[PDB]
Amino acid sequence: LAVRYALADCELGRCLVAESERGICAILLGDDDATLISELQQMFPAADNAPADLMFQQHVREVIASLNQRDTPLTLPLDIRGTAFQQQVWQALRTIPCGETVSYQQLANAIGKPKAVRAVASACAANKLAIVIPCHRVVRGDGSLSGYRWGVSRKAQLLRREAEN
């Protein structure tokens, strides 16, 4: 269960990158370290920083690069943890093209459960891999940018950079 983490600056502000032995297991965004670290401790409790792990620090620099660019895919291995339903929702987020948004209902319609709009909504707000799993791309259909796990200012910022020119 070993989980390593680092804190770095990025265009969206402060982020925490975390890595287990399977791959990047959390990418969290925020304004202050205390909160990122307890947020991470909530899901991965004895997670520790690893400043001298040369090989982890490289991976963090790779993850940051994706994070600051408009459409740079994260190649490193992902450690996606969740239920079949969450996994189905997150896998379908990843097929949303950079520059488009789908509403919760369209997403529920696309995965074969027109009925489960609420649960799809919840699956998006439970994403632990900011940006890499593009949960900023799903919107409630009414024109509002609510529902993002890391706030309206970052959701809005992300959508504005992908819908460019």
Q: CATH number of the domain that 147 lies in?
A: 1.10.10.10
Convert 93-114 to b/e letters by CB count within 10 Å (16 or more is b). beebeeeebbebbbbbbebeee
Q: How was this structure determined?
A: X-ray
65 HSE (CA, 13 A, CB side): 11
* 53 and 87 together in one domain: no
Element counts in the chain: helices (H) and strands (E): 6, 6
Tell me, what CATH number does 6's domain have?
3.30.160.70
In the block, tokens 């989980």 appear at 3
Range(s) of the domain holding residue 163:
82-165
* 153 and 86 together in one domain: yes
Question: What separation in angstroms does the CA of 94 have from each of 8, 47, 50, 65, 107?
Answer: 24, 27, 29, 18, 12
* 95 and 43 together in one domain: no
Quote the CA–CA distance of 143 and 50 in Å, as a whole number: 42
> Can you give the resolution of this entry in Å?
2.1
Q: Are 148 and 134 in contact (CB under 8 A)?
A: no
* 15 and 28 together in one domain: yes
Measured at the alpha carbon of residue 123, what is the angle toward residues 113 and 61, in degrees to the nearest 5?
135
- Where are the strands (E) in the chain, listed by range? 4-10, 13-19, 24-30, 48-49, 102-103, 138-139
* 29 and 51 together in one domain: yes
Task: Look at the chain and report how many structural domains it folds into.
Answer: 2
> What residues act catalytically?
135
* 165 and 146 together in one domain: yes
* 91 and 126 together in one domain: yes
Q: Which of 41, 64, 42, 61 is nearest to 53 (CA)?
A: 61
* 161 and 103 together in one domain: yes
